[PDB]
């Protein structure tokens, strides 16, 4: 018997696909980790030694894309007490997140990108998809080489630049320090081919997205490159964050606020504003002590509670987050894409959860955890 399992080859079959488009009871072939063939009845022999799973009766979807998360860990506001620990990864995983993007938050003196970097590529290792943001709340940008340009340029794993504004916990930033900061992510994604975009933490003042609309008048930076966050916080906020997405923008809910607006309500309301659901993205700002539940939740809000089918309900957290992050593979079950996918109940219960090809998640409880979970 020759030896063929280095390949990896594992049959999901008999699933209801939603890739996130609704494909019907349909197969997925794995092979190295991607999706090699997406069709209905592919033979149980097409390939050698292939693991068939029988998914009949199930769900299989793309795995979440959850691009605010404090990986290192972040808080810190109320005194040193209050700095949360870093995200395990079978937290991640168990709540269907398959690829992540870290950040820091309000504290950048005792969080650093370098912890950041390092983190994001220990999560790669063990086995999902990790990027970053450099730089924080804090403006000018504390980066790894000096430079927010460079650092997109050329540390591989970052993405682009996170900042804060109309926040009480800002730094201050004046119009000037914003718009060079977005344009060097900007240049420094097209240097190092990642989406270089300018993620803004918002908070409650009155001003609300006004710096990003001033950014706009001061420089060149596409508006499709400027992601204002945590946009449900406020009502009048959530409204400017409407009237930005329908300009063009792309807009980022986050699942971990209930109130004002929840997260299912916020999309909904997107939906309702004829906002597409490709501007709509959908973040748990997990570890922030925030957990990752708040994803899937919204999913199943949305098809139980609202009247989302289930393919929209999880463009927010699929299609979408990898399209305005130019992530190549990710969020579509199509060959040629990592074999990240989610196996369900039809009730949306996850089930089984595959990162690049293995199974990380078997009855909805990791059977791979970090290095010292
Ligand atoms: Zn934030
Ligand atoms: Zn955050």
């Keep these: 018997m020759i030896?063929?399992?280095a390949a990896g080859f594992t049959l999901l079959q008999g699933a209801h696909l939603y890739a996130p488009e609704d494909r019907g009871i349909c197969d997925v072939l794995v092979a190295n980790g991607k999706i090699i063939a997406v069709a209905s009845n592919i033979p149980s022999d097409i390939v050698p030694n292939c693991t068939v799973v029988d998914l009949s009766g199930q769900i299989l979807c793309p795995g979440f894309i959850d691009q605010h998360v404090h990986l290192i860990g972040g808080g810190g506001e109320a005194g040193p007490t209050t700095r949360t620990p870093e995200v395990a990864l079978s937290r991640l995983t168990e709540a269907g997140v398959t690829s992540v993007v870290?950040?820091?938050g309000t504290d950048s003196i005792s969080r650093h990108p370098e912890s950041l970097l390092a983190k994001t590529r220990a999560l790669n290792e063990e086995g999902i998809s990790a990027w970053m943001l450099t730089g924080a709340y804090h403006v000018p940008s504390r980066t790894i080489t000096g430079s927010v340009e460079k650092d997109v340029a050329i540390i591989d794993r970052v993405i682009g630049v996170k900042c804060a504004i109309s926040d009480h916990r800002s730094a201050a930033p004046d119009v000037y320090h914003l718009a060079n900061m977005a344009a060097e992510s900007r240049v420094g994604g097209l240097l190092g081919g990642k989406p270089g975009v300018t993620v803004f933490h918002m908070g409650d003042s009155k001003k609300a997205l006004q710096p990003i609309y001033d950014l706009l008048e001061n420089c060149d930076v596409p508006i499709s490159k400027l992601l204002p966050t945590h946009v449900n916080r406020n009502v009048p906020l959530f409204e400017q964050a409407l009237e930005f997405a329908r300009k063009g923008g792309t807009?980022?809910?986050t699942s971990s606020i209930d109130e004002p607006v929840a997260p299912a309500e916020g999309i909904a309301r997107a939906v309702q504003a004829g906002i597409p659901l490709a501007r709509v993205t959908?973040?748990?700002d997990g570890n922030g002590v925030?957990?990752?539940?708040?994803?899937?939740?919204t999913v199943q809000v949305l098809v139980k509670d609202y009247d989302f089918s289930i393919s929209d309900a999880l463009r927010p957290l699929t299609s979408s987050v990898?399209?305005?992050?130019?992530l190549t593979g990710k969020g579509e079950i199509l060959p040629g894409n990592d074999?990240?996918?989610?196996?369900?109940?039809?009730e949306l219960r996850i089930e089984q959860?595959?990162?690049?090809?293995?199974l990380m998640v078997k009855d909805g409880k990791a059977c791979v955890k970090g290095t010292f979970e």
């Design 339 to 346: 074999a990240d996918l989610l196996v369900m109940t039809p």
């Design 290 to 297: 925030a957990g990752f539940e708040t994803l899937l939740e």
């Design 251 to 253: 807009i980022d809910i």
């Design 3 to 5: 030896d063929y399992t």
């Design 282 to 284: 959908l973040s748990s």
């Design 322 to 326: 990898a399209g305005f992050l130019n």
């Design 102 to 104: 870290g950040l820091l």
């Design 353 to 358: 959860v595959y990162a690049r090809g293995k």
